[PDB]
């Protein structure tokens, strides 16, 4: 059924403070791994 | 208190175009004299890229 008179982005209602770190936190396990510049830091 | 002196060259500063010219100046009128050469800066290597380096260690903390 073609439904335009709601509005379905209702899911923001619901998030706390945390979301976008614990999003973050579990996306973690999905990523590739870094390229690495061969030192620690540009300090060291 | 005032600064008393008793040496007729204390303020004679002469000026000339090149080094030959003060060494013959020097030497015509019979002053012992000694030469020290000209210090000029060598040339430097600058990069407004070298602040942003991938991996060196010239990148800046800041700006």
């Known amino acids: 059924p073609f439904d335009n008179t709601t509005y379905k982005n209702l899911q923001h209602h619901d998030y706390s403070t945390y979301t976008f770190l614990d999003l973050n936190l579990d996306l973690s396990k999905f990523r590739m791994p870094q390229p690495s510049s061969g030192r620690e830091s540009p300090r060291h | ?63």
């Open chain 2, 1 to 63: 208190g005032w600064a008393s002196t008793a040496d007729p060259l204390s303020n004679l500063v002469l000026t000339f175009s090149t080094k030959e010219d003060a060494i013959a100046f020097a030497e015509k009128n019979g002053w012992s004299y000694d030469v020290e050469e000209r210090k000029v800066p060598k040339p430097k290597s600058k990069s407004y890229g070298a602040n942003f380096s991938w991996n060196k260690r010239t990148r800046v903390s800041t700006k």
